Structure formats: structure tokens, C-alpha cells
Design a protein around this ligand. Structure first.
Ligand SMILES: COc1c(F)c(S(N)(=O)=O)c(F)c(NC2CCCCCCC2)c1S(=O)(=O)CCCO
Ligand SMILES: COc1c(F)c(S(N)(=O)=O)c(F)c(NC2CCCCCCC2)c1S(=O)(=O)CCCO
Ligand SMILES: [Zn+2]
Ligand SMILES: [Zn+2]
Lengths: 261, 260
């Protein structure tokens, strides 16, 4: 029953989910004082991201976000283990305040954020097993700005009126997930953190790409208005808006960058 | 309660339920939520010129450094008189010297001064006022780096004597209005909360628009002089990063006394 607003909102998550009050929490504000270049942060390789358009992938409203399941033959390499994709999802604001990224850059929110969740498939047989192990998860984050219409993101957003309510599922034809990534993916921020939702496990290696992508105001409005956190038959409906966590204290961490300027 | 580890701000709501309730402070003061309000006339700071012949208690309470203030000191210009009770500060650390509580357009200032007052027309003391309607009013001064500030030094020159939790020192009276910035007529105003436990949503906030300056050495002194542990603690903890993260603030406004 955790939420982003009211008595079950984020200042209360730790009452039920102790790690949400623990160390290494995400998201964070990316600002100069805590950035340090690291020349070892070489480019990731995106393997099997080009999903067949003749296949289909499950889109689910889970009550907290909209997620797309991804196949385990999709991987990132370049890490010291190979990590396999498990799902992607988004975080966003609301129609009257389209400023719902989780990470901030120099104190500013972007309109939204995409997360592509992977797990260490060298070591673990599924993401649920990996999720409570050190470096078990690797999440890629793409900052999203209001801008031009994005046909690639629309391959997801065009299905939103079919997963309006919690528990609903739809199919999305495959497409090349690398189309959701920004330019110059070799340029990224890297840090050790956590899930940004309960149970807040501090088991995530985060990669936030330096450059944002754009989606239109109309795409953001669809994202911000189509979805509910509640079931179709709930007599107390709740709009799925503002589903981002506030940024967290650093706890002495630095953020490492693959770019020096 | 603390500002880190297991007893840090995400856990305050366990013992202090209002920390997970409504109207929480601090917040980001940013353009899209500001609205000019002509009713926001200047405050008057009365009895702020504290007698040099009196002394005022400075404490390290393990969370900040606080200076007790006398109840004859008050704000005029609100519907009720709000009498002073104490002032204190919030700051970051030398590696990231940006520890204000409020932010402006997403940016932290170096530090922030709060002068806490209570509604003495309605309530007999600050403790009684603290959980009641219209109970508290806090003035906030944003602090940045710049030239040396002799007035802030009237406080900071005492910090070494309150290095550890529980320690105290006496500060001779001075003019507290010297701690306020230029053009105090220009301010942000909103209804919010204490930024520490118990987080009561009973604070009328006034954040002055313009910051003050202190020197690099003054800011470093503030950031390095104090511990949040008692002197005999075999595991000392520096008092740094003693600010709360900004809170969500949806479907409201911060009112401004200025439009331009
Ligand atoms: C939108 O919610 C998120 C979420 F925000 C994040 S984030 N931002 O990447 O940390 C997630 F990683 C996940 N998924 C992970 C899947 C792999 C491991 C299994 C445990 C859940 C984590 C999810 S979730 O949709 O699955 C809901 C999890 C509720 O506990
Ligand atoms: C540094 O801690 C603060 C503090 F941050 C704030 S803030 N930022 O102005 O909301 C405070 F107001 C207070 N003092 C108030 C005094 C008047 C009412 C009695 C209850 C305590 C609030 C204090 S305190 O040093 O006294 C510690 C209180 C722990 O409960
Ligand atoms: Zn996420
Ligand atoms: Zn304060």
C-alpha cells in the first residue's frame, strides 16, 4: 500500500521497509562537488536490445509505474559480469507540473525518467534472487526532457489506454530498445545506490546517461493522465502521478563520470 | 534522531508521525510556484537589540548550535505577536558546502539561519505553542560565501566553547537584526512545518529573498567546530550536513512580498 503521497508516502516507507531508511539510497542530485572523472568507465555494450517486431512483450500497470518485461537474452556488457535485462519502467510528474525525474542534475528535475533494470545473470537465476545481493542489479537511467515527439517512446505510450488500472496487462510488439537511449551513451554517471522504491535494497549499480532524450508535451500528458494506481473497480481511485522519490543524502558517496568535461 | 545512518530523516516518522504528515518543510522555492501577494507587508523586528549587559545561552544540543533568545524580542506585523525563543543554523560540510534547508530554483545556499518565534498572544511558551494552530513563526536567512561578517562572528567566536553535545557558553547581547539581510521587506512566505522532529505542521515560514555573506573561514569554522556527540563519547561524530532534504510541495503556492 506504499504510495508517493499521504500517510503511506515516502517519508513513511521505512516504517515497513527498513532499507528505505538505510544507507546508499537513490536517487541523488548530480552536482559538481560530488562528481569525479574515472577513466576506467569504458563504454557499455547493449546486446540483444533490438527486439523482434514479430514478437511481443508484456506491458503491466503494477500500481506504482508502467513496466515492460524484457527477455533475458538482452544484456549489457562491459560490466565485470554480464547483466541481463528484466524490465523497464518510468517515473513522471503531473499535467500541471511535468517535472518528475528521480535523479536531478545541478538541482533541476527533468520531465520524466526511464529505467532499464538488469540483474547479474552470471551469478543469479532471476532478478528477484539478485535483488538482495551486492551489485545484484544494474539500472540504466535516461533523463527525459519535454521536447520533440519521440516515435520510439511512443511504441510504449501508444498502449497506455490499455493498462489504465493496476494489474492490467497488454502486449507491445518488439522494437529496438536502444532507440530509447540518448546520444553519446559512452558519457554517463556511475554510482552505488539502491532501488528507488520499497524495499529500497542497496544493491543497484546505477548508470545515468549524461544526455537526456526528448518526448513531447502531448506524450507527457498521455503518460500523466492515462494511468491509475488502483484497480478498475476501486471506489477510491488514485491517479498515477508524481511517482518519483525525492533525492537522498549522499552518505559520503561520490559519483563517477566517464566524461571529464 | 540524526541526519544519517539508521536514525536519519527517512526514519523520523517512526517515532515522530508528523514527519510523515502534511505541510512538511523545507521546500524548493522556484518560479512556477511563486505568487506575489500585496498583503505581505514588512515585518518589524522589535527588541532585537539585546542588551550588551545581559547574556544569552548558547548550546550544542547535538543537532545544531542554538542561542536562547528572550521573550521581549518579537516580530510585529503578523496578526498575533510572535515572541522569540531561539536561533540556530543548518550547514553542509567542507567537501560539499551547500547545506541550506530551503533551496531557490533547485540550488542550495551554503547555510541557513533560523530565528524561531512562538505565538505569545495565544500561548504561554514555545513548547506549548509548538503543536497548536498558528503556533510558530520562523525567519530564515540564506547564507552564502563572501566577505567576512562581523555580526555573525558575534556567534561564531563562541563555537569552540560549545564543541560537544551538552556544552554551553554565554553570549553577551548584540543586535540580532544585524544577522538579517538587505531589504527584509522582500521575502517568501508559506505555511509549513518544523524541519526537525517532531515536524509539527505549525510554522509560518518567512524566508528572506536576499542572502547574507560570511567568509570562507567563517563557513569552514561553522562546518568543522562542532560534534554531535558528548565529549566522552568514544566514537565522536562531526556535526555536518544537519539539514533536511526538500519535501514534495504539490498544488500550492509560495507567496512573495515582491513581484519584480
Ligand atoms: C517502479 O518500481 C520499480 C522501481 F522503481 C525500480 S528502480 N527505480 O529501478 O529502483 C525497480 F528496480 C523495480 N524493479 C526491480 C526488478 C528486479 C528485482 C526484483 C525486485 C524489484 C526491483 C521496480 S518494480 O516496478 O518492479 C516495483 C518494485 C516494488 O518493490
Ligand atoms: C535544530 O533543531 C531545531 C530546528 F531545526 C527547528 S526549525 N528548523 O526552525 O524547524 C526548530 F524550530 C527547533 N526548535 C523549536 C523550538 C520551539 C518549539 C519547541 C519544539 C522544537 C522546535 C530546533 S531545536 O534546536 O530546538 C531541536 C528540536 C528537536 O525537537
Ligand atoms: Zn525506477
Ligand atoms: Zn532550523
Amino acid at each position: 500500500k506504499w504510495t508517493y503521497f499521504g500517510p503511506d508516502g515516502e517519508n513513511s516507507w521505512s516504517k515497513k521497509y527498513p532499507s528505505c531508511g538505510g544507507l546508499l539510497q537513490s536517487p541523488i542530485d548530480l552536482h559538481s562537488d560530488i562528481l569525479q572523472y574515472d577513466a576506467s568507465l569504458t563504454p557499455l555494450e547493449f546486446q540483444g536490445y533490438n527486439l523482434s517486431a514479430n514478437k511481443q512483450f508484456l506491458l503491466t500497470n503494477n500500481g506504482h509505474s508502467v513496466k515492460l518485461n524484457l527477455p533475458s537474452d538482452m544484456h549489457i556488457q562491459g560490466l565485470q559480469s554480464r547483466y541481463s535485462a528484466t524490465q523497464l519502467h518510468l517515473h513522471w510528474g503531473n499535467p500541471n507540473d511535468p517535472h518528475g525525474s528521480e535523479h536531478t542534475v545541478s538541482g533541476q528535475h527533468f520531465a520524466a525518467e526511464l529505467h532499464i533494470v538488469h540483474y547479474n545473470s552470471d551469478l543469479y537465476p532471476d532478478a528477484s534472487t539478485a535483488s538482495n545481493k551486492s551489485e545484484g542489479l544494474a539500472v540504466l537511467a535516461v533523463l527525459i526532457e519535454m521536447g520533440s515527439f519521440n516515435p520510439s517512446y511512443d511504441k510504449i505510450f501508444s498502449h497506455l489506454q490499455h493498462v489504465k488500472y493496476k494489474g492490467q496487462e497488454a502486449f507491445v510488439p518488439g522494437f529496438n530498445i536502444e532507440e530509447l537511449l540518448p546520444e553519446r551513451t559512452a558519457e554517463y554517471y556511475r554510482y552505488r545506490g539502491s532501488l528507488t522504491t520499497p524495499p529500497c535494497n542497496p544493491t543497484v549499480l546505477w548508470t545515468v546517461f549524461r544526455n537526456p532524450v526528448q518526448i513531447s508535451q502531448e506524450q507527457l500528458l498521455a503518460l500523466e493522465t492515462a494511468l491509475y494506481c488502483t484497480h478498475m473497480d476501486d471506489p477510491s481511485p488514485r491517479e498515477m502521478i508524481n511517482n518519483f522519490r525525492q533525492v537522498q543524502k549522499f552518505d559520503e558517496r561520490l559519483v563517477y563520470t566517464s566524461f571529464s568535461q
